[PDB]
Amino acid sequence: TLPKRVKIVEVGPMDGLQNEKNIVSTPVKIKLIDMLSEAGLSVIETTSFVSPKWVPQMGDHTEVLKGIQKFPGINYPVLTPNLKGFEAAVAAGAKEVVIFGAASELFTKKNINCSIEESFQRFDAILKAAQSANISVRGYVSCALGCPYEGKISPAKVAEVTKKFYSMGCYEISLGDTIGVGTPGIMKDMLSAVMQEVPLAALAVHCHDTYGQALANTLMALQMGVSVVDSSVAGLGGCPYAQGASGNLATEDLVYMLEGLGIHTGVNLQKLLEAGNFICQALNRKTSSKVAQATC
Amino acid sequence: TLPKRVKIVEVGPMDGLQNEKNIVSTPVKIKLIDMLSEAGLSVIETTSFVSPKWVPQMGDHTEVLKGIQKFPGINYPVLTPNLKGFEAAVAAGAKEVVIFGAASELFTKKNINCSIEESFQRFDAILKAAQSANISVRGYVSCALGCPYEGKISPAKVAEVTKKFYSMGCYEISLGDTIGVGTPGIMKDMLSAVMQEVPLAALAVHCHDTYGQALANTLMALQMGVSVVDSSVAGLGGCPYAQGASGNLATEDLVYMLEGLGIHTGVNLQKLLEAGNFICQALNRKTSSKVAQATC
Ligand SMILES: CC(C)(COP(=O)([O-])OP(=O)([O-])OC[C@H]1O[C@@H](n2cnc3c(N)ncnc32)[C@H](O)[C@@H]1OP(=O)([O-])[O-])[C@@H](O)C(=O)NCCC(=O)NCCSC(=O)C[C@@](C)(O)CC(=O)[O-]
Numbered sequence: 063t064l065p066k067r068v069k070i071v072e073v074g075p076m077d078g079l080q081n082e083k084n085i086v087s088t089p090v091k092i093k094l095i096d097m098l099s100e101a102g103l104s105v106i107e108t109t110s111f112v113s114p115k116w117v118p119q120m121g122d123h124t125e126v127l128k129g130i131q132k133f134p135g136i137n138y139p140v141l142t143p144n145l146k147g148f149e150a151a152v153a154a155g156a157k158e159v160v161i162f163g164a165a166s167e168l169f170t171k172k173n174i175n176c177s178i179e180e181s182f183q184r185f186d187a188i189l190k191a192a193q194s195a196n197i198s199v200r201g202y203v204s205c206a207l208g209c210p211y212e213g214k215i216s217p218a219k220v221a222e223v224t225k226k227f228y229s230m231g232c233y234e235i236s237l238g239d240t241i242g243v244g245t246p247g248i249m250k251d252m253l254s255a256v257m258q259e260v261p262l263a264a265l266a267v268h269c270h271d272t273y274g275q276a277l278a279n280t281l282m283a284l285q286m287g288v289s290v291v292d293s294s295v296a297g298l299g300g301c302p303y304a305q306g307a308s309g310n311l312a313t314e315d316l317v318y319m320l321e322g323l324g325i326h327t328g329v330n331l332q333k334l335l336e337a338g339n340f341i342c343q344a345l346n347r348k349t350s351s352k353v354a355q356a357t358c
Numbered sequence: 359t360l361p362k363r364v365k366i367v368e369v370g371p372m373d374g375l376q377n378e379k380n381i382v383s384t385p386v387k388i389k390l391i392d393m394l395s396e397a398g399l400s401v402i403e404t405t406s407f408v409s410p411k412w413v414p415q416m417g418d419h420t421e422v423l424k425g426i427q428k429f430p431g432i433n434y435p436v437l438t439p440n441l442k443g444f445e446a447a448v449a450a451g452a453k454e455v456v457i458f459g460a461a462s463e464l465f466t467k468k469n470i471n472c473s474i475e476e477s478f479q480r481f482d483a484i485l486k487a488a489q490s491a492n493i494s495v496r497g498y499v500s501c502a503l504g505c506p507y508e509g510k511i512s513p514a515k516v517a518e519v520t521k522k523f524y525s526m527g528c529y530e531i532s533l534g535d536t537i538g539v540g541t542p543g544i545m546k547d548m549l550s551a552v553m554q555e556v557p558l559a560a561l562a563v564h565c566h567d568t569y570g571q572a573l574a575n576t577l578m579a580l581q582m583g584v585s586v587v588d589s590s591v592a593g594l595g596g597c598p599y600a601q602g603a604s605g606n607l608a609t610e611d612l613v614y615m616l617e618g619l620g621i622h623t624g625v626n627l628q629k630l631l632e633a634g635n636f637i638c639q640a641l642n643r644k645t646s647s648k649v650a651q652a653t654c
C-alpha cells in the first residue's frame with residue numbers, strides 16, 4: 063500500500079532553473095530557496111558546481127550555496143559533475159552532493175564518449191573523497207523509463223546501474239524519466255526490477271510531465287512503496303531532448319495529491335504556492351502548476 | 359485489475375465547448391465532431407438539447423446533431439434535461455440521450471434548477487419514453503468527489519443516486535468529478551461504495567483536471583475495474599454552472615497512457631491531435647494536451 067510519509071525532493075532551483083530559457087539574478091535564486099525552506103521542504107537541490115562554460119544558468123553556484131539560510135534539519139544538496147566541481151562544492155560548505163548517470167549506452171556515449179561502465183570511473187574519486195569528508199552522495203539514473211536515443215529501456219538494465227550507484231556509496235538513487243515518455247506499466251516494471259537489488263528506502267523517482275504522465279507515474283511509484291519523489295516548484299524545467307512540452311512534475315500539484323491521500327509531507331502548500339509565484343514572476347512565465355492556476 | 363480495453367467517451371463538443379464565452383459556429387462544431395469520428399472514437403457527446411437561455415453555446419443542438427456524419431459503429435449521445443429536450447432530441451434523430459444530476463442538492467438547484475428528488479421525476483419520464491423506442495439512456499452524477507457549494511460529498515450519497523439512475527433504466531452512469539478536487543483515495547472510496555450497488559460494466563468516470571489530478575484519478579478507476587472514461591480533446595471544458603470549472607482530462611493524454619499500458623482504445627492519436635488542433639485554432643486558444651505540445 064501507500065507510504066505514510068513522503069520525502070519531497072524540491073529540484074526547482076537546480077534542475078528547474080538549469081532548464082529555463084531566462085536566467086535569474088543571484089539574489090532571486092537565494093530568495094526562492096529561502097521561500098522553499100519556509101514552505102517546509104526537507105531537501106532543496108540548491109545549485110550545480112558546473113563549469114559556467116557549459117551551463118551559465120548555474121554560474122552563481124558558490125555564492126548561492128553560501129547565501130541561502132540553512133534551516134534546521136533541512137538538506138541542500140548540490141550537483142558535482144566532476145571532481146573539480148565536487149571540490150568547489152565542499153569548499154563552499156556543501157554537505158551533500160549528487161552524481162548522475164544513465165541506464166542507456168547511447169545516451170551516455172553521446173554525452174561523454176564512454177560506456178555506462180566507464181562513466182562510473184569518473185565518480186570513484188568523488189565517492190572516495192566524499193566518504194573521507196563525511197559527505198553524502200545522491201545518485202541519479204536518467205532514461206529509467208525510456209531513452210530519446212535507444213527508445214525502450216530494459217528494467218534489468220536500470221536495476222544494474224542503480225545497484226552500481228548504490229554499492230559504490232550512494233545512500234539514495236533517484237530514477238528519472240526526463241523525456242517523460244513513461245506510463246504506469248513501465249514505471250511498475252522498472253521499480254519491480256530495481257527493488258530486487260536495492261532496498262526500497264534508498265529509492266526515489268523524478269518524473270517529467272512532458273506527456274502529462276508525471277503524477278500518474280508518481281502515484282504508481284508510491285503504490286510500489288517508494289517514499290521519496292522529486293518535483294520542481296511550479297513545474298519549472300524542461301528537457302533539452304524533447305519538444306515544447308513542459309518539464310518537471312509540479313511540486314504544488316504533488317503536494318495537493320499527497321495531502322488528499324492523507325500522506326505526510328510537512329509542506330505548507332500556501333507558502334509553497336507563494337514561492338512558485340515569486341520565481342515565476344521573476345522568470346516572466348506562467349506557472350505549470352494546475353493547483354497554482356486554480357487557486358489564484 | 360486493469361481492463362484490456364477501455365471505451366473513451368469524448369465530450370469535447372459538448373462539455374468542452376459548453377463553457378466558452380466566444381460562441382463557436384455551427385459548421386465548426388459539425389466539423390469538430392466529424393474529425394473526432396475520423397479519429398476513431400466510439401462515443402462522442404454531440405450536443406445538449408437544453409434551453410439557449412441557460413447555455414446558448416449549445417443552442418444549435420438541433421442542426422448540429424442533424425448535420426454531423428453518422429459513422430458506422432460510433433454513438434452520438436446528446437444531453438436531455440427533460441421531456442421537452444428529450445422530445446427535440448428524438449426528433450433530431452438521437453439514438454441515445456443523457457440525463458444529468460448530482461449527489462449535491464445545491465449544485466442540482468443551480469444547474470438544472472430543481473431538487474434531487476425532482477430530477478428523478480423528470481428522468482423517470484424520459485426513461486419511460488426511451489425504453490419504448492430502444493433509445494438507450496446514459497446518466498451523469500456530478501460532484502461525485504465533492505461539490506463547489508456543499509463541499510465534501512459522501513460515497514454513500516453518490517452510491518445512492520447512481521443506484522437510482524441504474525434501477526430506473528440507465529445502462530451506464532458517469533461519475534463526474536466536476537470541479538477536479540478529487541484525489542486517488544477519495545476516488546477509490548466513492549467507486550467502492552458505488553460498486554456495491556451498481557455493476558462495474560455500467561460505470562464510468564468523468565474527471566476534470568483543474569488541480570492536475572484527472573489522469574491519476576482516472577488511473578485509480580481503471581485499477582478499480584472501471585472500463586469507460588470521459589475526456590475532452592485539447593483538454594477543453596468546464597461546466598458553466600459549477601463555478602471554477604476548468605478543462606476535462608485531455609483525451610490525447612489519456613490515450614497516450616492507455617496505449618502505454620497496452621490497452622486497446624481504437625483511437626488514432628495522430629488524427630485525434632489534428633481534431634484538437636482544428637478546434638483550438640477555431641477558439642483561438644492553446645491546446646491543454648501535454649501530448650499535443652510534445653508532438654509539435
Ligand atoms: C432543466 C431546464 C429545463 C430548467 O427549467 P426551468 O428554467 O426552471 O423552467 P421550465 O422548465 O418551465 O422551462 C425553461 C425555458 O426553457 C425553454 N426550453 C427548454 N428546452 C428547450 C429546447 N429544446 N428548445 C427551445 N427552448 C427550450 C422553455 O421554452 C422555457 O422558456 P421561455 O418560454 O420562458 O423563454 C434547463 O433549461 C436548464 O436549467 N439547463 C441548464 C443546462 C445545464 O444543466 N448545463 C450543464 C450540463 S451538465 C455538466 O456540465 C456536467 C457533466 C455532464 O459534464 C459531467 C460532470 O462534470 O459531472
Ligand SMILES: [Mg+2]
Binds near residue numbers: 373597
Ligand atoms: Mg464535465
